[PDB]
């Protein structure tokens, strides 16, 4: 059985840049550190920071004060924002640099009282922050999901909108949602294309890569990560049997039972020592040696904050 | 006499990249290592590339065959690239990640055989690599520098017209040309603002707030320097003497004579040490401590290519 292996796969630089900010604000200043939300959406990082003493909480209102607090790399909203700065806290910003980007736009547009559009997921804590930025009661800010959400969708001045998108969705589906809404308003702005970050577009590109060779793709990821649902649902619907999974053990024999070919990629939130595991266990399965695709290098790297280095 | 000193300032995260891919290429092959255009605008960093190997050339037909190439920071046309890819020779290529984004762009509409307009200086390599990104008959490339430009541009179809701009350029001129082009090409598409990078937006809103404290600023960054000159500029612009210098070897008396404050800042393409000398020679005529102000993090790096680690 022939292993191979995506590339690019796993750690974005906004997430490698998160992690070590907790890792490293523990270091610094030692247990317990606050971090609002999973840093990243990802079990395994998760539990081995919450295993060093950082303690994830829900709402602000749980931090003593005096703490040090991280936000998660989805960002927040500036509700959120502004009472942690209010509050007598430390904070540091774990945001990715790719999705402060999209804020500012929005609070550009909230500044001006003009209506925005975002293309998300409802519920997702990125989508959650990014409509956060918007507070002008005489624009507005609108969420659609699909082509069928444009349809349906009114707004006051259609001659003053733009749109922003959430940084881990379908570039497929995310380009029939933008053909809908210039159709639908002629003259709504945006970026040249969207705003679904580098990382995001090049795993789904190797993925696609991927899925052409393998029978199987497996996906290592948290059910609650985004991208990392993108690639599992890109590899299914060209055809091929695809599996999100934490870890090795949530491999099944029958899975790869007498399959050829298996591919293996992971989440820009999952770290490497997974993918290692994966591929010991299907080595221990009849896989021989991983062999990885050539693909599109990166050379994007987000510094943590000067304070904690 | 205060000295002040511009946050942020100096070294660019494309400028590091390039410089070390020259560096490395020498360590790992020896010398001579050729490099289309100085690597970076900065006499200091050419000349002793230059001492240690390096050899600039502006064309291909300048290097002989069998040698190594690397194309500057600041990008080469296609015709280039080709030419040196029909060439005998091992390629490699520092042009910085946000001037390639830009190229992209203009393949795309050269491809598509639709008009693209680019805002930017005539002559500079930046601008003769990017427009040499363009390459269909029956759309046009076309180069403004200013809204007069603009007043004056025909078009063969303005219903399919899209921009981009150099990346070194004044964020407050670029403003004004980009107005002209929306009011001259209503159906004319664009980024949300332009394609001036991080570094110039940072470094100009630096010397901006740098210049409201000092009487006189001092700009490290050669003559060719095309984001230095910006800087200088802006500070004229002010009403404060501004000047561009390689090295505290430029600085005459007379500019800071009887001066209660003077500012310094530094070009993307200016090291530090530079920076560190005019430092020096400003307390050899009477300043202080240097005191930084306060300023934009920026934590952006571009990693080297692994062919070149
Ligand atoms: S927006 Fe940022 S943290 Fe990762 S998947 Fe994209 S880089
Ligand atoms: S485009 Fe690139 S090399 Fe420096 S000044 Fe801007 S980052």
Same mark, same amino acid.
């Given at each position: 059985?022939?292993?191979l292996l995506?590339?690019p796969?796993?750690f974005?630089?906004?997430?490698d840049? &998160? =992690?070590? !900010?907790?890792?490293?604000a523990l270091?610094?200043? %030692? $247990?317990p550190?606050?971090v609002?939300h999973?840093? *990243?959406?990802?079990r395994?990082?998760?539990?081995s920071?919450r295993?060093?003493? &950082? =303690?994830? !909480?829900?709402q602000?209102?749980e931090?003593?004060? %005096? $703490?040090?607090?991280?936000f998660?790399?989805?960002? *927040?909203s500036?509700?959120?924002?502004n009472?942690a700065?209010?509050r007598?806290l430390?904070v540091?910003?774990?945001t990715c640099?790719?999705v402060?980007?999209?804020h500012?736009?929005v609070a550009?547009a909230?500044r001006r ?8 997921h ?5 989508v ?27 707004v006051?001045?259609?001659?003053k909108?733009?749109?922003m998108?959430q940084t ?11 053909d809908?809404?210039r ?13 679904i ?8 590109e ?6 052409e ?7 290592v ?7 990392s649902?993108?690639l599992?649902?890109l590899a299914?619907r ?9 870890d090795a ?8 039972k007498?399959?050829?070919?298996v591919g293996?990629?992971?989440?820009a939130?999952?770290?490497?020592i ?5 591929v010991?266990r299907?080595?221990?399965?009849g ?9 599109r290098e ?10 904690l280095?």
């Open positions: 059985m022939q292993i995506a590339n796969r796993g974005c630089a906004g997430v840049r &998160a =992690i070590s !900010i907790v890792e490293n270091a610094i200043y %030692g $247990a550190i606050y609002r999973e840093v *990243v959406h990802n395994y990082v998760v539990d920071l295993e060093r003493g &950082a =303690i994830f !909480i829900e602000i209102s931090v003593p004060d %005096g $703490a040090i607090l991280i998660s790399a989805h960002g *927040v500036q509700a959120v924002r009472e700065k209010s007598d430390t540091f910003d774990a640099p790719l402060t980007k999209v500012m736009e550009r909230s009282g003009e209506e925005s559009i975002l293309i998300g409802a519920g997702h804590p990125e959650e922050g990014t409509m956060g930025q918007y507070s002008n009661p005489e624009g507005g800010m609108y969420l659609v999901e699909s082509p069928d959400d444009v349809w349906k969708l009114t006051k001045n259609e001659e909108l733009s749109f998108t881990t969705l379908s570039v497929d589906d995310t380009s029939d949602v933008i809908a809404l159709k639908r308003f002629p003259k709504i702005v945006g970026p040249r294309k969207d705003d970050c580098y990382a995001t577009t090049n795993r789904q190797a993925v696609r890569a991927l899925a060779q393998a029978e199987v793709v497996l996906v990821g948290s059910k609650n990560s985004s991208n649902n993108r599992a649902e299914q060209m055809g091929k049997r695809a599996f999100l999974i934490d053990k949530d491999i099944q024999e029958e899975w790869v007498e399959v050829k070919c293996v990629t992971a989440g939130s999952a770290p490497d997974l993918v290692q595991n994966v010991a299907l080595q221990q399965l896989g021989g040696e991983a062999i990885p695709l050539e693909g990166e050379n994007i790297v987000f510094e943590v904050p000067k304070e280095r």
